[model samples]
Structure formats: structure tokens, C-alpha cells
Target: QIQHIAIVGCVHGKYREMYRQLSEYEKSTGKEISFVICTGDMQTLRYEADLVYLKVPPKYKQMGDFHLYYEGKEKAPYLTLFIGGNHESSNVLLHLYNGGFVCFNMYYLGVCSCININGLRIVGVSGIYKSFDEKKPYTYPPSPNDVVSLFHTRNYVIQMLSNLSQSSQIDISLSHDWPQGIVMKGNYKQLYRFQPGFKKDGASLGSPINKVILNTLKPKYWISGHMHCEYHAEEGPTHFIALGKIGYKNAISYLDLPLKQKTDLEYDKDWVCNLIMTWPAFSNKAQFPDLSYSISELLSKRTKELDKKIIELWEKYIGLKIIYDSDTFDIQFTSRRFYIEKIYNELNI
Candidate 1:
């Protein structure tokens, strides 16, 4: 048995093609991949307008193979794993949001959770998003029962990961959007040269919240899609690999990650606070008032009290370390910083 894992980009719903790619990689490399992880856009088109949840126009809704699994018409061919994306059968995925098996050997990563299999610890955050929860929590369009699309992120999900990160060292992390500014260190030129539209948004086209996770958790590998293009970058021990469209040649990325069990959340409170006090967006001397609390003390408090306190902690300290340290992983340089200063000023930062 081999231990390498296969990392896939947007599997949109081309279930068959993905199986073929998995087989091709095994045959060519002669490595038995343990399982496959998709970076979202794993649409479960169970209804007529299911495709509406995706970015494509209405004409494309019926193309997904997801219903085959949903209706018991098929079973996933491999040990598959994925999270939610902007485009999906939100109704179905929402039920599986806290993580559940859609079928045999297939797993959904939950809204945001960590799963450990065969020693490979995976951290996943679902959704290709827009920043909505900064001031008041982002409200929904009375999906109160309306079944369409929903960009999935909750303060609780963020809270769960924060608690997890303090205790567990993540081996791999997946998201639908790139971490803001990561493209600068990735394959930017080709991403925009061949597809200039991203030129307008690619550089700064990512989630700042995701960047906060990357900076804080510092997983060994970070995988994302939704950009529908390929780019690879390295910083510290974290390797960020972006995938393109499902059927596209660049859709799959094969890499190896065994449980390194690395943890860097052990610095002193002052070290932690002082470290976070450096972002251009940094502010207010680290929120959680208990200097002695550290990350552990913050979690051991009342459930409701802990919830609000952690959010306060995140607001003050999480994002201060937005800039990455690439000295350890600069194997190649891609599109150098997709966003310019003109774009930087656009964010509230």
C-alpha cells in the first residue's frame, strides 16, 4: 500500500472524469493514493435549477453526476472528500454541512472542521465567499426556506477551527478561494496573460479571512479552487496549490503529506500578542483581556461567553500576520502579486 494523497481542484460535477484522472495518476506514477480531496464546487445538482447555484448559466444545471449518488444510482469510485462551494445544491450540502457521508467512501468536510485519516490531518473551510460578517453577522435572503445558493461561513465555524488549531497541528487545509495576495507568489503571469479577466481581480482576489487562517494555522499544505486555473506557491512549510476547472488538464494536483504533527501555537502570550501587532490592519493591543488566558484559557470558559470572546480574539489578533514568509518554500514564482496598491486600498484595510 502507498501513502500519497491526491488533491483535486474544482470537480464541478464531472465525477467520471475525476475517477479517470485518479486512475491515470496511479498508473503513471505507480503510487496508490490513499484518497482524494476536492477544493469544492462539488455540485450536487439534484434539481432542475441546481446549476443556478453554480456560476454557469441555467443551461448547465443538468450536467452534474451528483444526483446519481444522491438517488443511489451510483457510488463514489474512490475515497473522496470535499467541502461546500459558492455553486452547489445548497439544500443538500447544508444538511451535510456539519459533515456526513453522501455515499460509501465519500465524505464532506463540514462547514469547517478537521478530520484525521491514516495520520493525515485535514483542515477544511467551505465556501467561495464575500466578506459579510465584519460588523453585524451576515444575514441571509430569507432562505428561511428558499433553496438556492448560500456562501457558507459562520462565526461558530470559525470558532471551531480556532479551537482546533490551538490543539491540533493541521496537515492539509482546503478552501475554495485563494488566500488574499497568494497569487503574487504563484503562477500569476500565465493565470492572467492567458486569462486577462483575472488581471482585474486575481491579485487581490481571495479571502482575507482565509489568509488569517493560513497565517495562524500554517498548515503544511493549502489547496483551493474557484479561480479555475493553476498556480503553485510555497511559504514556510505551507504549500499553496490552486487548481483549475474539473475537466481541464490543470484540475488535479498530486502531492504527498504525512503527519508531521507540527505545532507553532506554543509561543508566549506576549510573543503571540506582539507577533500579531504588526499587520497594516493590526489594531488595539490584542483583544482578549486576560493576558494569562492564552489560547487554552480562552476556550475553557463558558460556551456562550467563550464564543463571543474567541470572536473578539480573532478580530484583534488573527489578521495581523497577513504577509507570508516565503523564504522556506519559494521553489518557483508565478504571477507576482495579482493586486496592486490601487486594489489594496479598496479593502477596508
Candidate 2:
């Protein structure tokens, strides 16, 4: 059987309306949407206070519909997962920096996280790229000057996935910003006509770091937003699609994918190894571990040891639960062991 999926571009706080459209589509089509994937700019403001953290101009600022879902006034109709973009409630997203349920059925995919949903291996990195903040440590409740840059893509977050085994096959990868130089691969002349500044900006139109990550990871389908324009490209085995904002020409796309027998978020063995190898740097708040050799070398040397440990934990945990914890939104005990303690304990075991 095939599962119905909807991949949407930047929601920009239009949660209620987006859900309504999907619900209406279901009513007309009779096919249930198994899940939804948002590329970013979700602007999931949980409170009116969250607006203060949003980077939008005063005229553009308005409390969006996410607060209703957060307050339980309404619930998301499907399993919805989103990444973070330039315009977001940084204060609210900081709590789930490692990624967790923001509300019932809605998940933030962390700064950089890899998880399995129904046999599909999905990896996501939140935020846009800013070279200055790439190596800095993660800080929350950012200062006035640092508020916007707080969501900027970091070097370490991009590096986390580099340790995955060479044989790894990822189903999908998500980002808030487009990969650098992707325009050249497809519709560059068309994009230039639509957005003239893209021509002036030339090669610097998107994140160069993301380009390298895409080349390395080689996911089957790579989706992103932030550009607010629709573009498509193919490089080797990967198909890259950048969607527009909600009201734009190509804001949402659908696919009918084969569903695995079990419907759950299981741990991908290679990504588990990648996380375990690099969680130390991430937990210590460092950009990268001070290694004598490269990450590839580190993993190569400890492949057998790392595989044994990851297999043990994979059996013990099985998969992650999507339950919301109102008391403490920590993933440590609540959603598998996505925190320092959980991975730390596994290292010892």
C-alpha cells in the first residue's frame, strides 16, 4: 500500500489555513494524508510573546495560528514535521533544539537531526546559513543583535551527518535554505528572469555548505524553501526541489510513496552511528570535536565498536515515540534518548 504525503514550503504562520486546505483536499479526494513535511518559515508562535522574537517588521508581525495548536484549542490533522527558518519563534524552538514535539502531532526536526518515519529515512537541518555564526556555540534567548543570526546554519550542524557510512541511503533531506549553485543545474535562465537579483548574486545565491552536504549525503529527494520560488534540479541520484512560500505558484507538492509494514519512527543504523560519534561535540557546545584526524578516520577506526553499541541501543529503544510531554519537553526520557544523558549512557554501556 502507498502512503499519501504532502510536502509544503514555508508556512509563515499560516498553519490553520494550511491544515484547512489539506483537510478539504482529503474530503474531495478520499485519500488520507499520512503526513506533511514543511521546509521552514513555520513561524510557530506559541504565544503573543513569541512575536517579540520574530524578525519580521512590525507591520508584518501578527500572531499566527500555531498558538491554537500549542494551547490545544485545535490539533494538527496529520503527522507534521517542520524545520526552522529565518522567521520563527526562536524562544519556543530553543527548548527543542535537539528536536521534539512542539505540540500534539507537530514536530520540530531539531537544529540537525536524522530520524526514520515509517521505513523512510529523513534527515533535516534547520536555519539559514551565515558564515559568521557557523562555528559559534548554540545560545538561546539571543541578544537583540544575535536574535536573527541565532537561527543561522552552523558548521557543526552540517558536519553531524558526515560520519554516516558510505553505503547509507537516505530517503529525504530537508533544509530551510536552498543549496548553493543548484540553480545552474536546472532553470537558471528562468529563475534569473523571475528574480533578477539571483543573476546579480551569481554563485552566492544560496548556501555553499549545503551544496557540499548534498553532494556527500546524496539523498534521493532533497526539499527546501526560503527562496520563496519554485525550482527543480537533478544531480546524479538526487532530485532537488525548492518550493515557494504558501501563497506562491508552487507552495505544495504531493507524492504517493510505498509504506513499510510498520508505521513508526525507527532509528536508522548508520545515522545512529553518526550521532553517537559526534554527540560529544554537540553536547559540549563545541563546533567540532578536537580530533587528531578527520571524522572519516575516527569512524573508520571505530566502525566495529560503534556498530556494536548502536545495535544494542537500537534493539533496546526500537523507535521514537511522538507523545507530547507538557511537564518537561525533554527528549531524554520522553522520546527515546535524544539528549546527552541518553547517548552518554549508551556510550558507557
Candidate 3:
């Protein structure tokens, strides 16, 4: 029997607390867990200071402050995997690769479009669609020129596509031609001189990267975490799962998959399954709630009343509408009731 795998996304800089809670959960459950895959946004930025503050030092920096934050920990099946986010620096990708973290995997710094874990192919696309066109200064070290930063990101995308194409052993095919012309007007207009076309200086790759990845990998499950919204969508046999920010109030998700089942299936049954898990980050005891109220306030009768109304509204109107469904398959929605019991049982409280 393959162990259960828990996937979390968008953990900005709460690595220390996240790691601790995961450890405690594992110890309490006594069930060997699979990998902990973080979609993106592992650290706030890729610079030395921001990285240190985020408690995610590169392998070489695993000496002083890094060691001070995370040390004396080693185990298997309790592995943590990550990818680059918009906020992270390109160098951080190099750091993770050199650290021998995702060496066994056949991808580079686990970026671009796809990854395979234990025979289950999981494709992760970071930096969102907007990031592709935004001409904003790179904020890792904070560059002055938005134009330069935009070009840098464009170059990174080109290189990533080149590498991903080579590694996957497939020709680079895009839905739209490279350098699709950027729109000059409107609220969503493209700003920089970059346009999407066959050339490198194009505004964006458009849908070509996504098209190539989907065509080449033909993966059953496609996961992305840049929108900071928890929703799921399905297209044919492909499942698109979007995760919310982990630092949000009680926002966490457990994606349970068995190795043999996924391997044997020709196509994913559902495009997306929405699991309405608890947002523990909302709790006062949680180290990273957006609004840090007292424990008493969180558990007060008023809070409970508000929670009831919220639940009622969610069930009546917001349940299945937010999540996507496929024509050929059925998707399941696991609510707070289901997960709350699991947490209670695992914690033994």
C-alpha cells in the first residue's frame, strides 16, 4: 500500500512553523507519509537576507543562520519538494538543484511545467500568466529598471522551455506562435516592448508553453499555485487543481493518492476534486494568521455564530460552483467535517 501524500501550496515564509506542525502530525499519526510537495512561494525572496528570514537557506548556506533555523533533522518519506515562485530569485532555483534536493527527479530545479513523483506525473507551472507579461522590477534584490527585469524573466522562460523540452525528450510545440504581439491598450494591456512571437523578444510565449507541456506530458493531474485562490477545474481527462495561500486562515489541503491506482488508470477520473479543508492559519494559536486575535476570541460564541453563517452560505451557494466538473467523471468534495475528524483522530485530542 502506498502511503498518503499531502500537498500544500503558497507558503510565503512560515517554513519553520510549517515544518514543526508537519513533524508533529507525522509523529502523532504513526503512518509513514509520502512526499510534501510545495507548489511555490517557498520563500519571500531569493536574496540571502530574505531567504534566511524565510528559513530556507541554500545547501551551501546550510552553515550559520540556516543551521540556526533548521538542523538535526533527517528522514525518508518525510521529504519536502519545492518550485520557484514569482517572488523568488532565479538563483534560488540553482541553489536548490546544487543542494542535491531534487536530483533523483529528471527536471531542473522543479520549475517550468512538469514533475514526476513515484511514477505519478505531477505538472507544476509557476509565475502565473500575468507574470509572463508584467514589466515589473525584479524585487529579490530590487532592480531599478522594470524593463531589464522583464527581459530577465523572458530569458528565464526561454531557457526553462529549452531545458524542459530537452529533458522530456520532446520537440517544443506551442499552441500560439512565439512572440504573440502584446496589446498596447486596455486594463490588461501588455506594457513592455516585448510581444509574443517566434522570437525571444516577444511579449510572451502565450499558451505555447502550456500547450507543449500538456501535449507532451499528457499528465492526469495539473497543479498550479499563483492565483492565491483555492479552486479546481477539469478539461477532458486533465485535472487542474489551484491551491490557496497556506498562510490564509485555516487554509490547508491534503491530496490523497495511492500509487497503484494512479499508475493503473489510463486517464484521471475527474478534472478536479475540491477538498474544503480547515484553514488553521486563521486560528489565533497559529503563528501566521492574517488577523492575529486572541484564542478566546477565536473560540468565542460570536465566532461560532459567524462560522455557522459562513458554512451555510458556502453549502447553499458556493460549494460546487467554485469547483469545476468533467463530463465523463465524477468529482468529490470533502468538507471541513471530514477533515476535522481526521485532525482530531491524528492529534488524539
Candidate 4:
């Protein structure tokens, strides 16, 4: 379609607010965005419990267009693809975890899944870095803790990734957490001053699991959030971009990507749908019910543990073959190439 793609940062239930920003961009640029890929924390809270269980502060959950979609009252304005995060309500996404239509024009990419749209391959990992939850069933009338458990890296998602690695081919990768080593690039002074806990998380290398995944199946663009910061760096063909908080800085990113490339689309989402259809033997949670829409989200007696190979793979993938280092950063600004256009005068006298 030749329309550009918009990659957004942490959206803490500010769906309408972000849409307003999006509308403004279109007005200014006079170009329409094809679709949107939200980094994470695009909380789709439907009811009172959803609001109560969400990890963010109560005041942050501003009403957005998601509620209308959840209520069967309306549909979204643009086609949006998103994932779960530390802050979102994970109850329903669990049911729709294997990828399904969340609402009209809005699609959720599941916990860890990939999709292809108009020939462009996009891969994603949902939520943050948590010890994979292999214990306890998803309680229906869940505790706040249980709701959080739904987003943890399950064996199923990992295996999907494992298979994906073997097959190879991803153009873009989206996640709620920053890539391991890219944060090490850019100007660390400003980043560390803002994200003080970041330095302590690792005085060493990047996230081991992410390193393995990125190394094995190196996507072109890896975009993430959860750090409340912005940075860009390239290692080989992969360019890593992390964004700022939508609620605070009101940030968004754009990738001037082609709708199709000469490369054959691998890790295709339609093929993923086919995988879900023929889920038989070996992997866990591959089986689908009567219909994706008509199923229970709270599955009882979830994961118990992982095998040695999975554990080995998790720990072993390290020190990627570095051609380019992650050094460019701009946590304070939306884009590195900052522009000075006609400044809007907001006050009305």
C-alpha cells in the first residue's frame, strides 16, 4: 500500500489520547499510516475488575476507545496490532492468546506470536521479562497477581519462537522490554540518569533470552518499550528502537518500511494460523477449541516446568556477532532528527 507504519511506545490505556496524537500527525504530514504496532501496555480494561487488577496507578487508566470495542458498542479507527505487558489486563488476551480479532480494526498478536501483513513479516513478544509461569491455574475470578501471571513467558510461546528460529525470517520484532545490549549503546549518562535501575539490572550484557532470540532470528527492526526512554542503534541488519512513555512524554515512532520486499515472507502470520489449526503432539497449548471466540480464558493447572534443552538454549545464546554497536540514543526527544516546524500557540486569550 506504500503507507508508512507507526510504532508506538507504552500506551497505559490512553487509546483515544494516542489516536488524537495520530490524527494530529496525519494532519501535519498529510499522510495516512497503514497500521500501528503498539510496543506494549495498551491496556484494554473492560470491567471493574480489569481496572482494579491493572498494575499501573488508578489515575493512569484514562478511558479509551478500547472499552467501546469491548462493550460491542464500537470499533477502532485504525488497524492496530499490539501485545500484553506488565501493566495491561491479561484476562481476555489469554483466551485470544494464539492471535485473534480483539475488535474491528484492532488485533492482538498473542503472548509470543508472529504475523505477516501484505507480505511484511512482523514478530512480537508480549509482556516483560518474568520467570516463566509454569505453576498454578488461571483463576477466573482472579487475584491481581493471577492476572499478571497470564502474560508470563509460557513454554508454548518459547516453542513457537524456537520453531521460528529454525525456519528463519522476520522483518520487525516488537516487545515490551528493551533489547539486552542496545541499551549499552547511545549516551549512557542521560539514560542511566533517567533509568537508574537499568545499570543495576546488568553491569554485564543484555537479556540472555532476548539475545538468543535476536541472534538466532535477527529481524531488521527491533522496537521495544517499558524503559520510558528512547534510543536507536544498529547491529548488523537489525536496528533496535526503544520508545518513551505515551502518557508522560507522548511519544511515537515511524518506520519508513515497504509493504513488500523481495525476500520471501517467513514467520508468516497466516502460516501461524495454519500451525494453530494443525497443533498435534510435542508442543503444549497448541490445541484450539470449537471456536476462538467461544472459549474459556482461565485455563486450570497451567505450566509446571521446562526441559533441559529449553533451559540450555535460554542461558547459552550470548555475545552476538557485532558489526555495528548500539550507540545512538535520544531518551528526551521523540526522534533523533528533531525538526523545527511552525510552533503551535496553545493558549487562547
Candidate 5:
């Protein structure tokens, strides 16, 4: 059987906690996790005044760099992959740099193609819609223009889908006359589109990204994090898992794939488990309060409540197992309950 793969998304610099939990999970399970895939928003350079973009007076040379400090202890995953979220200062530059560091494993800088992950083909595209060559003091400001800029064109989406369809070797040979051998064997529909409008002051980059993804990948499963709220919608084979902001209530979202399914060559048997981890955000009242902590606390609290409701729904409707629930977090799954429980105990949180 292939190895178990546990995927986590939207880790906005909660590197310390995220790593600790990951390590404990591995330790308890005695089975190495295949990979950790982050959807984006790795850093917290949201505003111009956040010190990351601060300029030093001509006479004074900057002594330390905050980016390095924050990223120092954050270890790259065995097969870590990420994209640039709007909070990152320079999406292209960050993508290039991070991609280099990870030996080109990071995706989501621009219109990235697909990559094979442990024999599973995974494709990702970054969604920020800004000109790559802007020169003004750069900060993560929301833009109304993002929707148009980030939106994926129908042509691009079809191109990728054509390739995937061919690789998968599904029927519909009448599609031979069509470009990429794609003909309307059935109604080709847009499954997942990001709807913007989360923050009032900033523009929502979601819709364009969503449109592009819906058109291009036509992925059976799509995961994203921007609004800091967990949202899920299923349209036929395609599923959308939109995550809330990190540490929102000390909450984190995860996607799990069992090893048995991977080994059996049976996509139908594989299970996709969505998990919400809730914990308290360590608060700091001094220094105008760490907005990071503020956001984390808020996220954790909100997601904890959401998780309870979700678990109840799953029990009544789906009849899944609730493996863990504490003031820290809660996990429910249709399968892989023992594996999750092992991870919780190892972490001892």
C-alpha cells in the first residue's frame, strides 16, 4: 500500500504549533506522513506598517530581517507544496524564491501546471491578481482589480482538463475532433468558483481564482483558504474545501487520504477526511496586541463551534466517528479514526 498522506492547509505562520502537532502525529502513528500541502498565506505581511515593508532611514542600516527570523525554524515538509496568498509582499518573487528553496516544489506563484505527487497527479494555480511589475512600496493590500487579474480564462482551464482527461483515459472519443480531444460528451460545467468580498476595505480575489480553477483543473477535489471560514460544496465528482483563517480560534483544516486506498488502485475506495483543530490563541495585551494572536484566537473559537455542529451533522446524516474533542480541537471522520486518535494521543494536547 502507498503511504498515508495527511494534508494541512492555511498555515499562516503558525509554523511552531503546526510542526509540533505534525511531529506528534507521526510519532504516534509510527507511520511517516507522505506530505503536507499548504494552500497559501504563509507569512503575515498584511499591512504596510507591519514592519516587514518598513524602510530604514538613510543613516541607519537595518540590523535584522523579520522574514528570515520568522522562517528560520519552519522546516520544509518531505513533499511540501504551497502557493502565494495575498498577504505575501511579492507573489512572484516569493514563489520564485520559495520554489528555489524547495527545489521547485512550491506552486501557486503564477499559472502553474500539474505535478505528480507520489503517483497522484496534483495541479495548483496561485490566485492573486496583481501586475508582476508593480514598484510602489509593496504590501498585501486587497485590490478590486484582483478579480479580473486572477480570474482564469476558459481556454486555459480547458487545456489542462484536456490533458487530465487524456491521462485518465475516460471515454468520449467523439471528442477527438475537439482540441485536446475534449468534446461535449456531457455538460461540461464550472464546479468551483471563488466568490470574493470578505474584507470591506480590500478587494476579494476569490472569484477570479475560483473561475480559473473551475474552468481549468476540473479537479475532483479543490482546497483553498482566504476568507478564514471553512466552506464546503460538492458538485458531482468535484468538491471544494475552503478553509478559514489560521488560528482563527486556534483552528486548522486538514485533508486525509488513507494508505490502503492509494495502494489498491481504486479511487472509489479512498476516503477524504476533513478535520478542524481548535485551540486557544496565546494572547499578548502589550504592544498594541499581536494581531496574529488576535486573529488566531478568533479563528480557533469560531471553528471549534463549527466543528461541533459539523460532527453532529455527520453523525445524523453520514454516521462517521468522532475521534477527538477537547478545549484544544475536535476531529471527526468516516474512516481512519484510529490513525487520528493515535495522532491526538501522541501530541498529548
Candidate 6:
């Protein structure tokens, strides 16, 4: 069993064109694309008002076809997955901060999130990294001055991703910025020749924080964009790939990943545990929260006390046993309640 997926980079609001290219590739290759994963710059402009939040100048901004998908005037041909880029409809994406369907078939992966899709354990974080905003708490519909900076990656989000279980196997990890110093793994000479703007040393490109995550997670496949140039590398178990912008050559690539386990998407238990534990500190606050100990260390223990806290919160907000599991999970399957309990038991609490 195999899943055929397409990876695109820096869409820049070219929704229709991307889909058209995918369709053309399918016709030529005689293979159906299961999913379309976009790295960033997917400018999801749902309304004309959303343009105000975009960082691009007025001349560069275009509504694209996303508004058509948003209004139900049209539908995406495939299940499209995306993360935020430096240039995006901040106003529109803010509403789905925790990540959700922006339209019928397009899903935003959120600032930091993990979800299983067709048996592949996919993890993603949105936005480019900026040191100034590394520790700020998330505030929706941010102020005019804070609008662009709000989308910049935060330390807490990175902390949350680091909380994933060490035992878990991550199939694909997606990020908008390339991990710093990855060009050496690929043909740097070719890259520099194609895009002469890149330094000969290639030391100043990509994100340092992202590089740390890449090394720590060591996912089987680490895919990224924002460089707008195609490069490939291999670091031990991980295969790193960085793609160019949508219209650029080598912007789209295909993967035939084997079906490794369950064919349905499920919430990552460890991620959920981390989210529950950190809710008090990070959610809807203007300032970064104070913590006694390192969050990753605190959550990694997963002791009885932690389990109790998660269970209590789950009962209040989500419920111990959902009456309508079908509201989220497939009707025939056990609900999130089952997974929560499984996590509790796994900790032997």
C-alpha cells in the first residue's frame, strides 16, 4: 500500500494554477495524487478585507481563487494541506490558530501541530522564524504594529513540538523556513549558481531554531520552503528537501510513501498532553508566561499528577466520553476519549 503525495513551495496565492499543474502531472504520470502539501506563502485571502493584513504591497497582492473556495463558489480538486508563510492573510488564518479547515478541502496545519493522515504521522509548524518574537504569546487579530511579527515563530511553539514522544516515528515534518546550513547536504554550487543572491558559504540562509528541531526530531522526511530554491540533502535517517516557489522549476515534487500503520488520521496523544499542560501559560496572553522548570522536561515525565491534570481538563472542556464521537472522529471508530485513556494507561498512571 502506498500514498502518492505532492509537495509544493511558496504558493503565493496561486491556488488554481497549483491545482492545474497537479492535474496535469496526474494525467501525464497516470497516478492519482492523494494529498497536496504546501510549504508556505499560500496567501489564503478569504475576503477583500483580509488584504489589509498581508505584508505584500498593494500592487503584489491578488485575491487569488481561495475566496472562491471559501465562499463555496468552487471546490478544491484534492485535499490540500498548508502552513503559513511570511506573506499570508493574517486576519483570516488567525481564526484557525489551532488549525482547521479554511475551506472545503484545504487545511491549515497551524503554528504547531501533529496529525496522522492516511497512516503517515505528519507534523508541521507555520510561519518564518524571527528572534524578536521567539517568546511572545499568541494573540489573535493582532494590532497593526504586531500583525507581521505575530506570524513569526515563537519559542513556546517550538517547545510544544519538542514534547512529542521520543518513541513515536515522524514520517514527514514540514516547516516554512529551511533549516540553517542544509545547503551543504545538497549541491550548493548548483544552488548558488541558480540563485546568485545566496552567499557562497550559505551560512546566513534558513532558520537556526528550525535546524535544532530538524536534528532533534530527525524525521524520516524533513520538507521546507521559503528559500524559493530546490535542494535535497540526507542527514542520517532524515531526508531533507527544500522547494522553490510555485511557478519555478522543481517547485513541485512527488512522494510515494508506504502505508505504515493505521490508514486514518488520529490526534497525537503526547502533543495533546503538552497542549493541555501548557494551556495556562501560553493561551491568549500578551506576555510570555513564567515557568518553574523546562516545559519539555516537565511534560516528558508524564507522571500521575500530569495525567490527572489532563484528564480533569479533558472532562471539563472535551468530555471523558463523547456522546457524538462522529463530530470529530469517524463514526465507526472509538472517540478521542479512547485515545486520552490510552495515553493515561501508557504512562501507567
Best by TM-score, which number? Answer: 2
Expressed as tens digits, the lDDT of each residue in 120-201 for candidate 2 is 8788888888888776666533455556766888776555776542665788989989888777888889888888878977
Q: For model 5, how does the per-residue alpha-carbon lDDT over 291-334 read when each residue is reduced to its tens digit?
A: 33332333333334444554454444334421212111112111
Task: Look at candidate 6 and give me any clashing residue pairs.
Answer: none
Predicted structure 4, TM vs. truth: 0.70
Q: What is the TM-score (0 to 1) of candidate 3?
A: 0.45
Q: Candidate 5 overall Cα lDDT vs. reference?
A: 0.37
Better of 2 and 5 by TM-score: 2
Error of 4 at 135 (Å): 7.6
lDDT of 4: 0.58
In the range 1-349, model 1's lDDT, one tens digit per residue, is 3367788888878887898889888889888877788988887666565544454556765557877776667866667878877766664565444355665566776566676666556788887656563222222211333333255444334434554455457778989888888887767787778768778775577887678788888998999988888888886778999888888899987876553553221212222222222212212112212233243333343244433433345434332122222221111111111121122223232
Among all windows of 10 consecutive residues in model 5, the one with the lowest summed lDDT is 172-181
Per-model TM values vs. the true structure: 0.69, 0.87, 0.45, 0.70, 0.46, 0.84
Q: Kindly report which residue stretches of model 3 are placed more than 4 angstroms away from their true locations once superposed.
A: 24-31, 44-77, 94-110, 113-116, 130-208, 249-251, 260-349
* TM-score between model 5 and native: 0.46
Candidate 2, residue 257: how far the Cα is off, in Å = 2.3
Against the true structure, candidate 1 reaches a TM-score of: 0.69
- Model 3, range 1-349, lDDT digits (tens) per residue? 5656655666665655565656666788775556666666554232344333222334522222222223224222345555555444343442332111322211222223333445454434444334545332223222333312321222223323323322232211111111122111111223232222324534343434454455444445555555464544454455545455666633345556556543221111011110111223222211212233332232322233444444444445334122322211101112222332343233221
Q: Which stretches of candidate 2 lie above 4 Å from their native place? A: 140-145, 165-167, 283-302, 314-319, 330-339, 345-349
What local lDDT does model 2 show for residue 177? 91
